Amino acid sequence: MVSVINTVDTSHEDMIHDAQMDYYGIRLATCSSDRSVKIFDVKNGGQILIADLRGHDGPVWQVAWAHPMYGNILASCSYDRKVIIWKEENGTWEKTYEYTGHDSSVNSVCWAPHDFGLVLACGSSDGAISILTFTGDGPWEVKKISNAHTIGCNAVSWAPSVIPGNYIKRFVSGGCDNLVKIWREEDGQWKEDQKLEAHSDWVRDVAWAPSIGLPTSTIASCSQDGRVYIWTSDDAATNCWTPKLLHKFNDVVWHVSWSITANILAVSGGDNKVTLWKESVDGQWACISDV
Amino acid sequence: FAAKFVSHKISRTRWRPVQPDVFATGSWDNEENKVCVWATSDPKQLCDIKHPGDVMDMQFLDKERIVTGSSTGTVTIFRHHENNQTLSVNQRWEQAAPCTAIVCSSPEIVSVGERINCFRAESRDVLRTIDDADSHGVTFLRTTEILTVNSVGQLKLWDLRKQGNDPTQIFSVTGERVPLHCVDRHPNQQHVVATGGQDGMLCIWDVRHGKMPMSLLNAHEAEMWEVHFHPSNPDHLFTCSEDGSLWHWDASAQLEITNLLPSSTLSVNSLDVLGLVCGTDAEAIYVTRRLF
Amino acid sequence: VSWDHFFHSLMLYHEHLRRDRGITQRELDGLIACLQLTCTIIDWSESARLALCEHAQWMPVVVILGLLQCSIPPLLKAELLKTLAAFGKSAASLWQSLEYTQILGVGIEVELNEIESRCEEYPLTRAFCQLISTLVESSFPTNLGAGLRAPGFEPY
Amino acid sequence: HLRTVGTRRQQELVPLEKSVTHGRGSLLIDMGLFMGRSFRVGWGPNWTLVHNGDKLRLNAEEDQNMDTIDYGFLPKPTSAKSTESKVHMEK
């Protein structure tokens, strides 16, 4: 069981939850279960610490860099029910805003594609997602969706910015009800465009693959059942998401991420191992390699 | 010098890791090859080892463990549980042709043949094997360098640390007259070394100071046997010859070499002296335990 | 100021050496003199020694450790010990550093073996002995040697 | 309610786990001095217990990074891991 797995994995060195590279590949923000948001710098492949942003009452979960068009911003969420936004002004890594509008833990964060503005979407474990929209100064107005997922939300991922050339943005998230809900937003409010039930247990992560200009928008999802599904939309404007099984492991899959160019899926989970997958010329997915 | 008939032609003797009081001994050349631990000091045959296979290598693998190498180039080691008087046979390898000497580099029990099979500390798989045929000198000049000395008495510094299978260096006499029986490497500095000539000579060596034959001799009679040296007085040492003979060359004294031991017997077994034997080329039975 | 610059050079010099006694004799002799001026200035003045011991820009304790760890010359290792003397005079901080060094002692045993094999006439031995004596003069710390069983202070 | 019940079950398991740890300390406690030959003990379990506490029923269960992070690359990849290093210097 879980205890057995823990026994198997002693842990050679401390561990971290999520860690994301900066835009421009300069910095590398991290976070671990000690409540500490460390920003490293990677010039020439060598890791160097710059700051330990401490400030969460519980373990930090996921972390996401904002687009460099808004200066240098990094946001991190946590088990403390709070989300922190750290700005930078000359090496002045101070927090310019903090949001505490969800009553249970905050499993994930993600930034809207840079054209839509500076919108941050956040899924809680209460079953609610809070989205923060930037105005002129330090005000941040929140658009909250209550009871988005039944027993809590784990993943949040933004649909690629698709020009209507009058702009429509779609977001799909997974949670612990097994449903991968997509989201549609009009004037301001966000409504569930569709539900996606193919998982037999808690949806862990849900990644909306970047469109290579290509209109055949894809999304990937992984769950406690140990299955990875690559849900596809055959065309623009047809509410058809057809799931296709990538693989099933006997153990849980924790995280899924899309590589930019080739649409390679990095499947993190199972046996402490991470696999890389490319859709073949035949439409079946295959494992390229073991990392 | 209290002698004792084992009535068993001795091949090994260790002042055990635990002064030279805990004697152990390995008796080759018997119909079920022999070794005794805690014998005798006073009968004390606590571990008179009933054992197939003879004694090529031999080491006190702890103060409660015993390593050894067995007759066909096999390997043999138990853990000398002197409390309960039983043990457990630790190491038993098949085909490590016998081995010709025994070296150490803690705790990879390095050795040489007359091919190298580097077993080590709990390395029950034969890890390193620079399988270079040898045409009996074996030590650790520095970890984990060594120098194989073939029976042309032909020393050659190789290793098992870096990769490779050649030797790195070579020590050699002008004429290669004697064969590989007995070389020396000083505890005063692990880059200081000598040898004993099987005519009755020395063969002193300089690692840094060139590579010349420093000091021969002409003192003993037979093949180079083995040398008692003090385990803390590096300089104090005495010489021997392959009938089991022993000429006290007082080398902490200056050539003061005389008819030393209780002499004139047959050969002597193997060397360990601290606070004892200096075993000959032919390993017969003998004893004296008064080494201070 | 100048001392900080020297410390930066030492860190930079160490980095260069690592990338590469692995450096022009005149440049190395220069470094021996830098460390010998450093050691002398620290001992002589209590305030200067204190500044050397706990000034973040200088990074003397860490740089010295890196130099020691990297392959290095005997004069250089002696000036690292003379640097350590200032910190010693300034114990828990020093003991903790020693423990960290031990953790980073098989390596210490190897160094001892190398010393036995050598070495340049024992010129290196005396300074290390003196540093050990000063540390011993400093009060013992219960926490140090905790990680190893029972008696960490005794083995040294 | 079911989740709460499972935590109640999970909590019970933890209490059982705590009892087991106590027994191990009680059975494994070692006191040799001044210096004694080292003996085996469940030193590792205590280290794992702290990690479990940091992770902390349902929440903790579905809140433990299976690894657990995936890195996405543009031109072209990046690294990732979790993990035997979590970056690879690819030659």
PDB file of all heavy atoms in Angstrom, chain A residues 224 252, chain D residues 10 55-66, unseen atoms left out:
ATOM      1  N   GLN A 224      -6.129   8.495 -10.549  1.00  0.00           N
ATOM      2  CA  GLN A 224      -5.826   7.450  -9.576  1.00  0.00           C
ATOM      3  C   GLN A 224      -5.986   6.023 -10.123  1.00  0.00           C
ATOM      4  O   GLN A 224      -5.309   5.106  -9.661  1.00  0.00           O
ATOM      5  CB  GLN A 224      -6.627   7.580  -8.235  1.00  0.00           C
ATOM      6  N   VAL A 252      -0.976   4.888  -9.684  1.00  0.00           N
ATOM      7  CA  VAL A 252      -1.435   6.247  -9.952  1.00  0.00           C
ATOM      8  C   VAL A 252      -0.506   7.084 -10.814  1.00  0.00           C
ATOM      9  O   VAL A 252       0.717   7.004 -10.728  1.00  0.00           O
ATOM     10  CB  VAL A 252      -1.653   7.062  -8.666  1.00  0.00           C
TER      11      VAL A 252
ATOM     12  N   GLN D  10      -8.463   5.888   8.472  1.00  0.00           N
ATOM     13  CA  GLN D  10      -7.082   6.283   8.230  1.00  0.00           C
ATOM     14  C   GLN D  10      -6.440   6.743   9.531  1.00  0.00           C
ATOM     15  O   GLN D  10      -5.281   6.443   9.801  1.00  0.00           O
ATOM     16  CB  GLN D  10      -7.021   7.387   7.186  1.00  0.00           C
ATOM     17  N   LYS D  55       2.997  15.738   4.593  1.00  0.00           N
ATOM     18  CA  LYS D  55       1.995  15.481   3.562  1.00  0.00           C
ATOM     19  C   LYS D  55       0.597  15.718   4.110  1.00  0.00           C
ATOM     20  O   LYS D  55      -0.235  16.334   3.443  1.00  0.00           O
ATOM     21  CB  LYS D  55       2.120  14.053   3.030  1.00  0.00           C
ATOM     22  N   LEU D  56       0.340  15.247   5.329  1.00  0.00           N
ATOM     23  CA  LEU D  56      -0.963  15.451   5.955  1.00  0.00           C
ATOM     24  C   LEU D  56      -1.254  16.934   6.127  1.00  0.00           C
ATOM     25  O   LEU D  56      -2.376  17.378   5.878  1.00  0.00           O
ATOM     26  CB  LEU D  56      -1.024  14.743   7.308  1.00  0.00           C
ATOM     27  N   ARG D  57      -7.247  12.491   5.905  1.00  0.00           N
ATOM     28  CA  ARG D  57      -7.386  11.190   5.261  1.00  0.00           C
ATOM     29  C   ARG D  57      -7.403  11.326   3.742  1.00  0.00           C
ATOM     30  O   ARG D  57      -6.356  11.296   3.095  1.00  0.00           O
ATOM     31  CB  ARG D  57      -8.645  10.489   5.748  1.00  0.00           C
ATOM     32  N   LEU D  58      -8.597  11.475   3.180  1.00  0.00           N
ATOM     33  CA  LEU D  58      -8.754  11.615   1.737  1.00  0.00           C
ATOM     34  C   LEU D  58      -7.781  12.647   1.175  1.00  0.00           C
ATOM     35  O   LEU D  58      -7.069  12.381   0.207  1.00  0.00           O
ATOM     36  CB  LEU D  58     -10.192  12.004   1.389  1.00  0.00           C
ATOM     37  N   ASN D  59      -7.759  13.826   1.788  1.00  0.00           N
ATOM     38  CA  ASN D  59      -6.877  14.901   1.350  1.00  0.00           C
ATOM     39  C   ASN D  59      -5.430  14.440   1.210  1.00  0.00           C
ATOM     40  O   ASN D  59      -4.870  14.446   0.113  1.00  0.00           O
ATOM     41  CB  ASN D  59      -6.960  16.088   2.312  1.00  0.00           C
ATOM     42  N   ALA D  60      -4.830  14.042   2.326  1.00  0.00           N
ATOM     43  CA  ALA D  60      -3.447  13.580   2.331  1.00  0.00           C
ATOM     44  C   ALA D  60      -3.223  12.493   1.285  1.00  0.00           C
ATOM     45  O   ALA D  60      -2.220  12.502   0.571  1.00  0.00           O
ATOM     46  CB  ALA D  60      -3.061  13.077   3.714  1.00  0.00           C
ATOM     47  N   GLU D  61      -4.163  11.556   1.201  1.00  0.00           N
ATOM     48  CA  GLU D  61      -4.068  10.459   0.245  1.00  0.00           C
ATOM     49  C   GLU D  61      -3.918  10.979  -1.181  1.00  0.00           C
ATOM     50  O   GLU D  61      -2.948  10.662  -1.868  1.00  0.00           O
ATOM     51  CB  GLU D  61      -5.296   9.553   0.347  1.00  0.00           C
ATOM     52  N   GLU D  62      -4.885  11.780  -1.619  1.00  0.00           N
ATOM     53  CA  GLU D  62      -4.863  12.343  -2.964  1.00  0.00           C
ATOM     54  C   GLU D  62      -4.171  13.702  -2.987  1.00  0.00           C
ATOM     55  O   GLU D  62      -4.558  14.593  -3.742  1.00  0.00           O
ATOM     56  CB  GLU D  62      -6.285  12.468  -3.514  1.00  0.00           C
ATOM     57  N   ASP D  63      -3.145  13.853  -2.155  1.00  0.00           N
ATOM     58  CA  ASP D  63      -2.395  15.101  -2.084  1.00  0.00           C
ATOM     59  C   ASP D  63      -0.891  14.844  -2.068  1.00  0.00           C
ATOM     60  O   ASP D  63      -0.097  15.763  -1.874  1.00  0.00           O
ATOM     61  CB  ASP D  63      -2.804  15.904  -0.846  1.00  0.00           C
ATOM     62  N   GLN D  64      -0.508  13.587  -2.271  1.00  0.00           N
ATOM     63  CA  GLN D  64       0.899  13.208  -2.280  1.00  0.00           C
ATOM     64  C   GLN D  64       1.409  13.030  -3.706  1.00  0.00           C
ATOM     65  O   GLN D  64       1.111  12.033  -4.362  1.00  0.00           O
ATOM     66  CB  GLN D  64       1.113  11.922  -1.481  1.00  0.00           C
ATOM     67  N   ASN D  65       2.178  14.006  -4.179  1.00  0.00           N
ATOM     68  CA  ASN D  65       2.728  13.961  -5.529  1.00  0.00           C
ATOM     69  C   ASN D  65       3.277  12.584  -5.886  1.00  0.00           C
ATOM     70  O   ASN D  65       4.347  12.193  -5.420  1.00  0.00           O
ATOM     71  CB  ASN D  65       3.819  15.022  -5.698  1.00  0.00           C
ATOM     72  N   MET D  66       2.537  11.854  -6.714  1.00  0.00           N
ATOM     73  CA  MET D  66       2.951  10.521  -7.137  1.00  0.00           C
ATOM     74  C   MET D  66       4.423  10.504  -7.532  1.00  0.00           C
ATOM     75  O   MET D  66       5.056   9.449  -7.562  1.00  0.00           O
ATOM     76  CB  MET D  66       2.088  10.038  -8.305  1.00  0.00           C
TER      77      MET D  66
END
